[model samples]
Target: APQQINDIVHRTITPLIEQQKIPGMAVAVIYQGKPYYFTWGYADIAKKQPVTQQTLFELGSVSKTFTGVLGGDAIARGEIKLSDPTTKYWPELTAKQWNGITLLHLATYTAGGLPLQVPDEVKSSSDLLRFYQNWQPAWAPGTQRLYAHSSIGLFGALAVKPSGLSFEQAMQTRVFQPLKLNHTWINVPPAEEKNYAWGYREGKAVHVSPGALDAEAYGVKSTIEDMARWVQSNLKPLDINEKTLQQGIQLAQSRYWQTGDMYQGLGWEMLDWPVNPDSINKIALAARPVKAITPPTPAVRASWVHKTGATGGFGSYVAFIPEKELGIVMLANKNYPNPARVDAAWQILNALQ
Candidate 1:
């Protein structure tokens, strides 16, 4: 099985590395309760360091999932409720414009009209408060989804504020530590800095830049070792000993919004099982529309749930099938297109099938 997995992963990633000029890649798969890791090329081309199970790659917007699960954890512990309005946490948001937005809306990107990135002028918390306080939605709250950044980051920031811990601290203690994700971080520690790989966006080597919401929105860096376990925790609740933490994952897996076979969870997106990899390209995120699933139905247990995340120089994708107990994590230094990531994972899953 290991050799077969290695072959399929090699066939899937080798061509892309040379063709796209990717400096390095790490693909990790867990099949039927066993894990396999495959690596190729370099983590740093200058240092000639090859990718390994420990290399940390920036997860971009996929970082939102961490925030979402944290929101769920807060709700589970009675610290917050999704039905509560924004004014409940950020009491300064007394403006009429902030009336209807709820924590659930922020978790799903349906708070209405949030830009994909925080506005450039919002350099501080005061600037963020002013922007949010004065903001108006393109449509009524809960009416639509634009897949934006401001609301989700705000959700993560405010979701844990009531507990008096910074968002990053809450995540470190509540999510990462309980899950034992030793290699995941909103901010990588200095000791692990050597394991952090450089990324290439336009032939220039770089790392994710710090900015507004960088910690809450798109700041997580991790290795496939931790990602495989992350997916496992999603697929099997008992994989995690902490019951409240498991509730966090379940809250996200249950459907909150839908677009045909695709459903939006708190942060991750779900695709009904038996997805065709060729049809994946059409499932783009930019300006894509999704509708709320009234009455709050849960997603089908048998489904192919996945998320694609990218930064200026890095790309990451995670997918898992609960029924089959299969999961994959693909991380690359070059920010390759989504279709390639989906196709590669599909092929590997098919290979196991």
Candidate 2:
């Protein structure tokens, strides 16, 4: 079984690494209750450092899943409700258009008209508030999905503000610690800085830098070891002993909304496995479109929850099938196209089944 998975990885990923010019990659898979890891290329091509299970890579937007989980946790603790308006957390939002936007809308990226990235002029909380003051939605709230970052970042801030903890602190205490994910971090500690890998985009080396609301959008860094644990937690959640944490995990995975051919669950994408294999590429590479929202579609069939993230230089993907108790995480120093990860991962999952 291990060889079967490994063969799929080598055949699908090895050529992609060479073709995409990825400097390094680390892949971890849990198949039928067993874990397997494989590495390729270099963490630092010039220094010739090989990527290992412990090497840290920027998780990019994959970090949003943690934020979504945090939102679910807050909901379970009675700090907020999904039905509560987004303005409930930030009372300064008095605009008439803001009235209909709910926490669930933000968490599920169904907050119509939020841009994929925050504007350059928005440098602080005050700037963000001012930006929203002049903002008008392209479509009504809960009417469409645009797949943006500002909504989730704002939702995460709202989720944590009631608890009086910063986003980083909440993740460290509420999620990572309970799971014993020592190698996962919002800000990589100085002691482990040596393990952080450098990334390249278009031949230019890049590294993670703090940006406005990055903690909630794209600031997490983790290793294959920690990501494997994360995937394992999604499948079984062995370390989530607290009632709120467990509730959070469940909420994070539930089908919250759907648009066109895409199914969304908090921050993750949902697709029926085996049945929906042909749809993986279209969903993974779909362009963000603005349209009227219709009734939600549930992934009632057995399926996989997936998400992909990439910064200027690094890229990452996480996916798991609950019914099969199988998952995969791939982290790479190069910001390869998202479909490459999806295609490669689909091949692996297909073989396992």
Candidate 3:
């Protein structure tokens, strides 16, 4: 870790926390597979405890990556195929047409027009099964892209259900255990509750509400050491063993669907980021989400894959630059929607580069 990079991260992130009054942050960066870890601000504002690499914050929708890994593991084990219908696991899936939303669609955020947020009709994970069963597609599956948190939850959940295992059990035993990530908990246990970071509102040190969902949509508590392993797996490809590593990165790298100017990979957002002034100016000119997802007229010089996750109390950003073999994970306890975690992570990357 260069003192120069550390200084830049502190300069950028420290103020965000102070001005916004966010409790704390844990940031890990991987450049050519090496890590630089930093933590700033407090974990429990009330207790005035500082944040550490060990401080666990809810990963929000980042949990979907675990689900993608589960699906890949199932395929590896011959439990199911990517094309298999969900009805194979749970006969309750009703939308005959929509149920064809394959494991790929779910993983890629293109499952038969699944919306980002389900209505009140979907209160539980089980309710997700019914909602999809009854869903009528507004767009053909894979023909268009719609971000669906619950839809992916149901797809990943149903894909693993046939094994007669809970989502947490499958993830822990299959992925986390093999990866030796003891600190990356799918759901915080009662014994580990004390270690979880106390979330904060923008201006307050403590949250006025309880911790957010502990289920698949937005859950998990992990430290930088644990997440750093995951980052290394993506960037260096050596941290993970052959079997798991191959499938994990393949899914993460696959360009399965287009989300605006970005291609939504299994659990990633892919883009060919521009390096020159013309391309940069074009993106700045258009300045639209969909437009940004799609590249400008010129050929993009380098590519990147990224994902952002935010529950009520936690916000996160993960990015991998294959060209430079770099990966970064930035996490915070506060939830501010615009730019959110991405803005902070990008600042660090800008400084380092």
Candidate 4:
């Protein structure tokens, strides 16, 4: 670990530790496949346990990236097609209500206009099916991108059918296993609970609660060690041992839609390298329906790919530049604003550059 790296991280993230009252953060910066680890504060305040590379923190919707690669693995296996309608996997839901919604739309959150979440009133599987049956599109799919959990949750459920395994099982077998991510999980095993961090919300220790479609949407827990490996896998998908899994990750990182320098990959939101704070902030904060750029602009090949996730109490962000072979992971116990997370990372990247 270089003093320059230490100084940069401290200069950028130290202030947020106090400003947002973040109890702990586990960080990893990987340069040319070599990882540099850093940690601060405590994962379990009551126990006085310090955060470490091995400590698990909730990744929230960043788990969606795992689901994205799961679908991509299915695609690589010829088990599914992006253009295939959602009804193909979930036969009970008719095409009429779904209105020709395809797997690609679901993956990109551009299925007309899906909500950020499944409605709270819908409680059971039957209710969930009914909710989908009655869903009315605000517009035709692909015309606009509306980021949401409902779309990706459906994608996650339908994506695993070809594997003949449950969603969690498929993720473990196809994605995690192939990537060798030992400490990442949709459901952390009971034995590994010792490493799981207790997230803090409003000064109270908390853990993410089970919710409808959470496993597919916002239910992954991981450590900096595992996540840095995950980042490296994506950074050099060709280096992965399993060719099929490598293809799946490559497909996941493929760009789907464009809005200025920001492009939407299956699970990652990408920006042209030398990414300005404005572009990152726009992608991070905006929630409304965004009409994608038609006849999109040129790709820089040098790209900044990233995702941000948060549960009720945890905030996690990952960013990597493939052209630079540079990447970073920041996992925190407090739910801070995304803009702050982005800015902190932007500064760190500048130092590395």
Candidate 5:
């Protein structure tokens, strides 16, 4: 089994890196509650540092799922209700578009139509409040799902508001600490800074810029070990003892909306597992752009719930099939195309099956 998996990795990942010019990658697989890991190339190419399980990679938007988990925790604790009006948390948001927006709308990415990026006018939390106060919707809230960051950033803020904890504080206290994910962080602690992988764009080394709202949307950075632990937890939350944590994890992964050909969980995309190769391609091709609202469909009974994340110079993909008790995470310093990621991941899953 190990040889077969390794061969699959070689046939797929080796060529992927060589052809795509990726300098480094860290991958982890969880099969039947056991962990398997492999690394390729370097964490720092020039210095010739090999990637390892401890090497950190910017998780980008995959960080969104963590925020969704936080939201679920808040809900379980009665800090927020999915159906409650958005105005309940931020009454200062008096814009006409805010009339029908609810916590669920933001969680499902159906919070009317906020742009994909934080506006230039919004430089701070105070500015974000003003931006929301004057915002207008292109469609009614809950009527559509538009993959956007502003809504989740807003949702992240609201998730911690009732607890009187800053977003980072809430995540540290409520999520990371409880899970014992020592290497995961919004701000990588000074000691762990050496483990942080350097990202590259157009062959030049770079890193992500800190923005006012990226914390909830795309701010977390983590190591393969931590991510593998996360995958295990998602597969089976045996280590977590709290009822709220368990409830939160369940709610976070449950489907809440349908967009075009896919279903949406809190921050993950839902598709039936053992998805055909062409369907994988179609999903990857449609990864970008706004997904139109389609008729609501029930969540796939046995599925792969996944998300892809990217920053200026880094890319990551995470997916898990609970039905099979299997999951995989791929983290790279180079911004590999999304479709390639989908293709590679699909191949690995297919081979295992």
Candidate 6:
């Protein structure tokens, strides 16, 4: 297909951001194997700093996946065991019912009763240990799924010690360096600040309310170009040590737990799309190369591995079909609606065939 297919996709999306006055958007698509990226509107709408292929935007919860990658790399390097209890690293956590919750449970969001947000009483690492020490699981571990960022964020810290590398270093060694993604980071380095996109609020892009100091939960700054490489890593994973790659992908791709219509696979979320029953043919054709394509009906749903993220003024989503081997990365500098962000990306996927 001509690259215009990509252009058309951008054309359809650009106006949405503009009309909503949502600043700008940067998108990266990995179809088949090649890379295609496009950016539109402005990163700093007030300053007229155009959203370029290089402007760094936040990843929000999408950064959690990087945390998961660290988990996998840690496992591969014999640093941390998924089977280990969260207390193994943070032993003080034994004070709560959290004693039974394993790292695997936290990684998979399977600790049944864990709050979606860490309770206010437990703000830092010490506070988290106290909360979990007394915590009781709402359901048995491995049976239920709740998206817990606090739990996963701590997992990043926990995964690092065993691997003999910091969370930041492991990411650089395992995923970033090999992928040639120098600009992606857990924390934006000092030198890159000028290119950082400011979050938009009320009337302008200089809004500081939604910033790193306040929204550390999902904070990650990256560029459209660098994010494209992250997308390619999903669709076209490199030929690493085959066994290690298989194990890493398996950890990433494994079905760990489910919630509502969404299922959790390591760090990604899966869902049924098209929201209909009779569209089986279209879904089938979409899935021909991989496996039987099933649409997400109330009864029969297809599995799509994706994660959504938002931090400060940015919102993001990256998902691809493991069977189909196609994925997309989306970053926007305004608070774009999640329903729109998700359904629209799926709409783009539907159009691919």
lDDT of each: 0.84, 0.81, 0.65, 0.85, 0.82, 0.64
For every candidate in turn, the CA RMSD to the true structure comes to: 1.8, 2.6, 5.2, 2.3, 2.9, 7.1
Instruction: Indicate the residue-level lDDT of 327 in model 2.
Output: 87
Model 4, 108-204: lDDT tens per residue?
Answer: 8988887787877877989989988888888888877878888888898888888789998898888888778988988889999989999999899
Candidate 2 per-residue lDDT over residues 1-353, each given as its tens digit: 45788788888888988888888999998887678999887788777788988899999999998888888888889989988988888999887878889888788776777777778768978898887767788877776777778888888888888899888999899889988889999888899987889989888778976677888999999999889888887777545688898878777877766555657776777776664545762343233543433444433336778899988899899988888888899899988877788888888877786
Off by over 4 Å in 5: 281-301
Better of 5 and 6 by TM-score: 5
Off by over 4 Å in 2: 281-301
- Count of clashing pairs, candidate 2: 1
**Residue 71, candidate 6: C-alpha displacement in angstroms:** 0.6
User: lDDT per residue, candidate 3, 88-171, as tens digits?
Assistant: 666777556854566666666666566666675456657656666677777666566556665677666776676789878888
Residue-wise lDDT of candidate 1 within 82-138, one digit each (tens)? 889988999988788778889888888888777777877789889988888777788
Which 10-residue window of candidate 4 scores lowest in summed lDDT? 281-290
Q: Assess candidate 1 and give its TM-score to the true structure.
A: 0.95
Candidate 4 lDDT (Cα, 0 to 1): 0.85
Model number with the top TM-score: 1
> lDDT (0-100) at residue 264 of candidate 3?
59
TM-scores for candidates 1 onward, in order: 0.95, 0.93, 0.83, 0.94, 0.93, 0.82
Off by over 4 Å in 4: 281-300
Query: Best lDDT goes to which candidate?
Result: 4
Q: Over 4 Å off in model 3, which ranges?
A: 118-128, 202-214, 273-302, 338-340
lDDT of 6 by residue, 175-223 (tens): 6776677887666778988778887656556422332112224656678
Going through the candidates in the order shown, the clash numbers are 0, 1, 4, 0, 0, 5
Residue 49's C-alpha lDDT in candidate 6? 89
In Å, residue 181's CA in model 6 sits off its true spot by 1.3
